[PDB]
Structure 1
Amino acid sequence: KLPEAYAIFDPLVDVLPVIPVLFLALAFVWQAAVGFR
């Protein structure tokens, strides 16, 4: 468990580790937006 005064952020921290995956996905949205050029 996190320190008491950051407890509010618990559900954010459950999701943070996944964020690097989203960068990979985001490169494919970008390439879709320029038509895989």
Structure 2
Amino acid sequence: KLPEAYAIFDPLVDVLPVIPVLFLALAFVWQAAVGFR
């Protein structure tokens, strides 16, 4: 477990690791917005 002071943040800590994947996905949102030019 995290030190107990930080416990409130457990649900956030659980999602953090996936963020780097959202960056790859972001490249595609972006490219779709400049029409894959």
State whether TM-score is above 0.5: yes
Q: Could you tell me which runs of 5 or more consecutive residues in structure 2 were left unpaired when the two chains were aligned.
A: none
Q: State the Cα deviation string for residues 1-37 of structure 1 (Å, max 9, x = none).
A: 0000000000000000000000000000000000001
Q: TM-score, normalised by structure 2?
A: 0.96
2:24 corresponds to: 24
More helix by share: 1
Aligned residues: 37
Secondary structure at the aligned position of 2:14 is classed as helix
Q: Could you tell me which runs of 5 or more consecutive residues in structure 1 were left unpaired when the two chains were aligned.
A: none
Secondary structure at the aligned position of 1:25 is classed as helix
After superposing on structure 2, the runs of 4+ consecutive aligned residues of structure 1 that deviate more than 6 Å are none
Q: Percent identity?
A: 100
| Root-mean-square deviation (Å) | 0.3
